[PDB]
Write a protein that binds this ligand. Structure first.
Ligand code: K
Length: 97
């Protein structure tokens, strides 16, 4: 019931994942982000800025529990926001979240 975790890792090793608020906003603006993942513990300001951007540009977004789990899913210690730049991986992740 946590298949999204290894899948996001697969997407990252396929170089289809970018992380960090600034870089994610860049992918959204370039129409390359097909799914954005943000943590429930993101700062109020960060969550607001990112979700407003996603909604404006019609990019789907989903939230995961913590920055530890999001970071670990892609081999890092912690991440607050990431973007998946491949439609295939995005569609699969959306159905698992
Ligand atoms: K981050």
């Amino acid at each position: 019931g946590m298949e999204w975790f290894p899948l996001l890792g697969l997407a990252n090793r396929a170089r289809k994942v970018v992380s960090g608020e600034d870089l994610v906003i860049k992918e959204i603006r370039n129409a390359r982000a097909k799914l954005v993942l943000l943590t429930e513990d993101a700062s109020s300001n960060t969550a607001k800025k990112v979700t407003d951007k996603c909604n404006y540009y019609k990019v789907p977004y989903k939230k995961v529990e913590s920055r530890a789990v999001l970071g670990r899913s892609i081999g890092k210690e912690a991440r607050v926001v990431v973007a998946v730049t491949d439609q295939g991986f995005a569609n699969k992740l959306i159905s698992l979240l």
